[PDB]
Amino acid sequence: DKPKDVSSITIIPKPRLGFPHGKGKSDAVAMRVNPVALTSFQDVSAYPDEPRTTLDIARIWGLRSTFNWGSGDEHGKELFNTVLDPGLRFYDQDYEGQITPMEYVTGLYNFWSGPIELRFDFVSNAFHTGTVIISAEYNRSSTNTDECQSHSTYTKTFHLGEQKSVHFTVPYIYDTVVRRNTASAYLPVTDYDKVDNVSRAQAMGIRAESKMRVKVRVVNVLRPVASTTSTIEVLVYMRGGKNYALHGLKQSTYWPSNSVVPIDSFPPDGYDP
Amino acid sequence: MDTGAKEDEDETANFSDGVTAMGFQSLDTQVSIKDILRRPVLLFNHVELDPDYTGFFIPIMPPSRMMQYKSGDKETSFQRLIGRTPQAAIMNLFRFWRGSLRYTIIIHSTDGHPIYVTHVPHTGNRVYGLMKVNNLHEYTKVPIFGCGLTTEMIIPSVNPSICVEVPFDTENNWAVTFDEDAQRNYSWRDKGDTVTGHLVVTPVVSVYMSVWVEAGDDFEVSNFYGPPSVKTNDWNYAFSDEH
Amino acid sequence: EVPSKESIQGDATQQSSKEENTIITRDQQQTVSENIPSTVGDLVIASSEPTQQFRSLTNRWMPINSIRVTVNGKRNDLLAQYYIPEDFLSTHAKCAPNTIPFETYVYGKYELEMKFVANGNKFQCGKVIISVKFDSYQADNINTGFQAALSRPHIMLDLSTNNEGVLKIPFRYHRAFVRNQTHKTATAGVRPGKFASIYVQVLSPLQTGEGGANDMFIRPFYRYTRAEFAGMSYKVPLT
């Protein structure tokens, strides 16, 4: 017999399946003998200590900044002072150097939130002695000469001695649940074009510059013995907190600046000498 | 990877860790490395296919610093902002990758001519763009798609787009993501270990195409290298919130 | 772990590490990198014949060349670097019995342990970082900073306290085996004797007091925790 098929359905034709998404469904055709065969990860596979998320990379400690602390530095003096924004290191100048892991990966997202962790390693010995105060300042910032303004915020006083390192969680205290990135979502300028006001006026967005600052002031002046150095360097590490969050994938704010060469055809393009 | 909590010997009191913002705005989490690598990157934007050649070669490798544009260098067919994509930035941290890649190819046509996409396994070379294989001047009688290799056809009149998944047909355990200098003439077998093969597009008549790339479902990365030395000038091309 | 009161021989609360016919003591605490795995499963496929270990020879401590750190040295400066195993065969400690199996076998898998001992005085100060980069051939000049070192498996050395550092290095290579030796008859198409790089870098410059010493020294020691050799051949001189 050859009976008629009365079954039918309305359809909406699309060219690709799950093109925008990182997961879900795919209409990908395997270039294989067996169409459902896949790569084996029985022996060779990702090692368990390797990061699985961008948040895992953000949990790696990275050296952000350094500053000197000497016996000449009078009490109340700012040893360190920065806007602690993981979007941009500077708002008013170019950056070039080794950016921290948490800053690198945060540069890929339009939004960030959660506490930021700092660690201050004092490159000293047992004969160095002094006290500093670390302060997280929000909304309103303190004068350079007014230590009392810094003392009125969220502070941690560290007595330098036998212990030469101190940890500091910077609280997330803002009017919004997340903060948008100060870097651009998309920047088509590739050849260091001389900027004008018309270029800025036709930008992708407006930079919401952070007023949150972290400062380090002298409490007790550094008083080392005559036999050792009078000045020491302090290494400032940074990473995302345990509840650090990222969202809204965008154009990367940072890009490699060292040993960048585009690929050529090997061996056609003059490899045979 | 070294977290560095090892070095953190201080055990004094600290402020609260609080509560995560993950899930508050939406459940669309975008932190997974695999999820970031599985969304597509534009390689070639409206590039010509010419039937005088064997075909347009695409080397099977993920986006990275290898395909990064630098102001002043010679003009290539590649997209200039490949190096500034999220997944390129991620791949700059991992020098090993294993598994399949997926290539979305769109032919700028509505004609009934078939355009063939042939997979070449790891042969040891690394090329891209239009090439005359063995420098001949005729390839219609000896097409690459009819030599024996695995091939798929696009028929633009039906569908101008396709998504093809290329296997990990190589000798090595891992594929090398990047080198310090991509144009350096070093040990020739090591030179070719940055790819796992090629994808060759051959037309009937002259026509343009666009090419995207992403990671497959069966895909892994390893050999964490950490962040490199970088530069930015994003600040300069935007106004602040105080005019 | 805890110091004691002074006696005839000072504070006698030292620890030590004994491996084969070699012992290394330590006066203060040590920092140790995480024990992380190597590639396993490919060994039985890559080599049809069984692989061999020579623990008595390879798993002993062997010192290599001395490293000098000066006050002139800036952050990010390379104090020393080692392409392994190459540099432990034909550059450093060439007459070591650790190198004997590399003469005859052409292939191998190698997991290492590297101990670093510093000796700066109590009126000095500074920070040094040692890190490992797996499968580094033609990628030594990128991701090669102090920041990349802090991300990768590493150890940190304070130059005043003289804390010891132990870097545990697994075998993470894009092939099943690494080639041990180049030869005139062998191919030049494959770079042999390099599956990883070790970097010793200044994290914070060395500083000293008035009329103090302008330098101090660090000594690395190496050993194989798991050295499996494959493909027996006639013995050759190393490089």
């Binding site: 060469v261 003059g270 490899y271 000498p273 | 200098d181 144009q183 350096r184 003439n185 070093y186 040990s187 | 990010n76 400066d77 390379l78 104090l79 020393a80 670097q81 080692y82 392409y83 540099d87 550059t91 051939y137 033609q138 030594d140 000049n141 090669t144 900073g145 770079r191």
Partner: peptide, 26 residues
């Protein structure tokens, strides 16, 4: 010619890469 092809003799080893002896590369 293309200067990326071959590394200068004073900084490099026989395998056309920076020598381990050459510390100043950084």
């Amino acid at each position: 010619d293309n200067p990326h092809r071959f590394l200068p003799a004073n900084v490099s080893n026989r395998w056309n890469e920076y020598s381990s002896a050459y510390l100043p590369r950084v």
